[PDB]
Amino acid sequence: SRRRVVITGMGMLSPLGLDVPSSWEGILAGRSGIAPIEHMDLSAYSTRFGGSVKGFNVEEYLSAKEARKLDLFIQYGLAASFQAVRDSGLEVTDANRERIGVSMGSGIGGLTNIENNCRSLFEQGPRRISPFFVPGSIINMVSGFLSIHLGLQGPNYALTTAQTTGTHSIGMAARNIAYGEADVMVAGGSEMAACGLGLGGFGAARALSTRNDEPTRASRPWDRDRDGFVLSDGSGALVLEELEHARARGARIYAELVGFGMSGDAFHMTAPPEDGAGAARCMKNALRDAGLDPRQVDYINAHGTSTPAGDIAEIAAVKSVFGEHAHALSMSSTKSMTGHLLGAAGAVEAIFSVLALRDQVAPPTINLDNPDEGCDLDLVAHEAKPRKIDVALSNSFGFGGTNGTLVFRRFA
Amino acid sequence: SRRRVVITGMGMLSPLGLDVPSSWEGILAGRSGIAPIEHMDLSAYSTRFGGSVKGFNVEEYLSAKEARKLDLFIQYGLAASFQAVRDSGLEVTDANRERIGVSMGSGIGGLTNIENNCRSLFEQGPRRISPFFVPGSIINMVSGFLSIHLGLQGPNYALTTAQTTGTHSIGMAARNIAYGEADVMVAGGSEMAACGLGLGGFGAARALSTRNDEPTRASRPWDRDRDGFVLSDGSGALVLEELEHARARGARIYAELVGFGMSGDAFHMTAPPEDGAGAARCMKNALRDAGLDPRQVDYINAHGTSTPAGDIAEIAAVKSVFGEHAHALSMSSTKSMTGHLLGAAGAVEAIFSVLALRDQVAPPTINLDNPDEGCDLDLVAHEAKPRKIDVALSNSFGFGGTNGTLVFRRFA
Ligand SMILES: CCOC(=O)[C@@H](F)[C@H](O)c1ccc(Br)cn1
Ligand SMILES: CCOC(=O)[C@@H](F)[C@H](O)c1ccc(Br)cn1
Ligand SMILES: CCOC(=O)[C@@H](F)[C@H](O)c1ccc(Br)cn1
Numbered sequence A, B: 001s002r003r004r005v006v007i008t009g010m011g012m013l014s015p016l017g018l019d020v021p022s023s024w025e026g027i028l029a030g031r032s033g034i035a036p037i038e039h040m041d042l043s044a045y046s047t048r049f050g051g052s053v054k055g056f057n058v059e060e061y062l063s064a065k066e067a068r069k070l071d072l073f074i075q076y077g078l079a080a081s082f083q084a085v086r087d088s089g090l091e092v093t094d095a096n097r098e099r100i101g102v103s104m105g106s107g108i109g110g111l112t113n114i115e116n117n118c119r120s121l122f123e124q125g126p127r128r129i130s131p132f133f134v135p136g137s138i139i140n141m142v143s144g145f146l147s148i149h150l151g152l153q154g155p156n157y158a159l160t161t162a163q164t165t166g167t168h169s170i171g172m173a174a175r176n177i178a179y180g181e182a183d184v185m186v187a188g189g190s191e192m193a194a195c196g197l198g199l200g201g202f203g204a205a206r207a208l209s210t211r212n213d214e215p216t217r218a219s220r221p222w223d224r225d226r227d228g229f230v231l232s233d234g235s236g237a238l239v240l241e242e243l244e245h246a247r248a249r250g251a252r253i254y255a256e257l258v259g260f261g262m263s264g265d266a267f268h269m270t271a272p273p274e275d276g277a278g279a280a281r282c283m284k285n286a287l288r289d290a291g292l293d294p295r296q297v298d299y300i301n302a303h304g305t306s307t308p309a310g311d312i313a314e315i316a317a318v319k320s321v322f323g324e325h326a327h328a329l330s331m332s333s334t335k336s337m338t339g340h341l342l343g344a345a346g347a348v349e350a351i352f353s354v355l356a357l358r359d360q361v362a363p364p365t366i367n368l369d370n371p372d373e374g375c376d377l378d379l380v381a382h383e384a385k386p387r388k389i390d391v392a393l394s395n396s397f398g399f400g401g402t403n404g405t406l407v408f409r410r411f412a
Helices: A020-028 A064-068 A072-088 A111-124 A141-150 A162-178 A196-204 A243-248 A277-290 A308-325 A342-359 B020-029 B072-088 B111-124 B141-150 B162-178 B196-204 B243-248 B277-290 B308-327 B342-359
Strands: A005-013 A034-036 A049-051 A100-105 A184-191 A234-242 A255-264 A299-301 A330-332 A391-398 A402-409 B005-013 B100-105 B184-191 B234-242 B255-264 B299-301 B330-332 B391-398 B402-409
Touching: A005 A020, A005 A072, A005 A162, A005 A243, A005 A342, A020 A342, A072 A100, A072 A111, A072 A141, A072 A184, A072 A234, A100 A141, A100 A162, A100 B255, A111 A196, A111 B111, A111 B196, A141 B255, A162 A184, A162 A234, A162 A255, A162 A342, A162 A391, A162 A402, A184 A342, A196 B111, A234 A243, A234 A342, A255 A277, A255 A342, A255 A391, A255 B100, A255 B141, A277 A308, A277 A391, A277 A402, A299 A342, A308 A391, A342 A391, A342 A402, A402 B141, B005 B020, B005 B072, B005 B162, B005 B243, B005 B342, B020 B342, B072 B100, B072 B141, B072 B184, B072 B234, B100 B141, B100 B162, B111 B196, B162 B184, B162 B234, B162 B255, B162 B342, B162 B391, B162 B402, B184 B342, B234 B243, B234 B342, B255 B277, B255 B342, B277 B308, B277 B391, B277 B402, B299 B342, B308 B391, B342 B391, B342 B402
Parallel strands: A100 A184, A299 A330, A299 A391, B100 B184, B299 B330, B299 B391
Antiparallel strands: A005 A234, A005 A255, A034 A049, A184 A234, A255 A402, A391 A402, B005 B234, B005 B255, B184 B234, B255 B402, B391 B402
């Protein structure tokens, strides 16, 4: 048997806002968080825009001294984590601190720090590398710093599964609770890859939209004029909690996490199979995990990256899993507004999936002016769609063919 | 109910050898793999030696076409994974490919590739970044590329928990199998952090031994003259398999994985607590998970990094967990010979713990000339100790205060 897992707190930094309610308001209004990247000479780059976090104030969370030791992706992860723990109302005590752990991940981790220390190393040699370079840049330091700050002694780890990180982090944290290794977990991911090496790295692979003239129209999942994903920064964190533990302290429960699927495509390093066979196995695994018939799904938060191949693979995957129900659910890509937060994508999209359940509304796929060949599902083009949502799926597909699916349900 | 997990295949690159048996021969003979680094000019650096893999031929495993795209840490991880799979005798089929996954992790990932692409960006501009920079550097692409080459469609992920990565990767993969999420997992880790950024970064923290004039004597866990860890490269991979699945196919079983513990110190970003309280919590979690009396433990493969604070914290933890039995078990640090493979340390040390069970011998702690104050356990100083070993424990403790413990026992 297995314990039940609920969501009792959420926290976020995104291109749409510095917390969950500001981000969610932007999502339901179809606002874009995408703009030209400031304070950076991107003249020589084929992409000059992305989803930046605007006006982040790290001194709301950390002292100047502790902030200087930490890459922006760690700052962002800690901001989301502190928000989520505050939102949960949980009180850490000597009686429960061994039962509270952390799994906050990242796809690409501390590129900004690596860039700045490369500069020191190439220009002045190794003796000008910062002493906090390593501990301030390693992906497991959101989990590490959070556990030190709050006194959490539970399972402490970090996933790095590229664009799937945030989905896997949440799913595995939910397993830890379900199988009794923890009663509470803070889970999610963070990313700040808008450095030269990030825009340059994805640019070299020609994976990014180059729609420099109209950045807000660049991210257009399933639209015939899409030309690659939009690179975005931020973080998402959820407080996952065993149901009886949540009920005993009178926690506000947002939703239940009922299903988690994983699969490998075993197909290509960066491209999904055209038929989305891997994504289809992963969704089927997640529904089996939840004991749910495909017909019970109302809402899918797609991976929906705005790549030619990825977007069409997900349509094929959903038609395959859902058959005669594939048109009755609503599926949307909030990446149309946020861009692609890479390892934080799954974290912020799990939060959007929980809020779709709370507010009974499917967020829009903006910029979906001209659906592509066979993109004839209900993709919630342009504007939010109030509807019945009992069950919401959130999908992530990443480099290496690594897939994850979360299944959330309304809690009563 | 929870299924039993056994080890049916192992694979390794280390400073001592290009496979498991050559590395193990070195371990039992007390040989050092530590030597001045040849692959770059380190005259500006305070540490100029480490544990290199010597004479690695990637063309034993991969086409030159594919090898050229991958960071050394990925090449090392694939080599160890291929060795492990071949050693297992397992055949991948349409009937079992959905039930075989991979969890190969890294602490730092493709730092050589990142540094080289940073150099291109700064000297020549973004148009000179490799198109393969991201998929060839990102930590999850051991798991990704292995799944693509062998057709593994089961759970596909990667951990990054700094110096605990290999132990956590093996533990969590064992839980996948235990809980029914897979029947087989390839799990471990790989590392190649020996570039200017890595030696410079750890140097800037003053975490490394600076014994440049006697590199084979540098790694001296629990010795009064120790002065930090020795940086080393390589990979370990194990094929973990559900017991009845192994029995059904007539697999050779090396040993059974009976216990896994995790804990967070919640103390400091880099330093362990002097009393080893988190390490003690982690070992107790693992022994209770294994259903053991602590007196059943015969051998501990320590973390034993050759840091002043780390080594003595481990003695304090072991004395706290095992009481008077702490004087009866044998505990050694193979890092005395291999140095510290960071995210691959737990993976190679899990293999050495399994071979300790197969061959009924405690590997030595070489260089243990003058044991420090209170380091008065059986630390297997200088020479391998043949002895009865039914139960072997492998510990790892990392930045962020993140702890892991694996418990292995003989299988009859
Ligand atoms: C291209 C992907 O790169 C990364 O993920 C890096 F962030 C990597 O994990 C790393 C390098 C150096 C140090 Br210090 C810590 N972590
Ligand atoms: C302080 C944590 O205490 C516990 O009892 C367990 F959580 C245990 O450490 C553990 C955690 C996660 C996984 Br996977 C496996 N084992
Ligand atoms: C008996 C052989 O060893 C000695 O005589 C001493 F040198 C002692 O072993 C020592 C101390 C510090 C370091 Br570094 C290395 N060796």
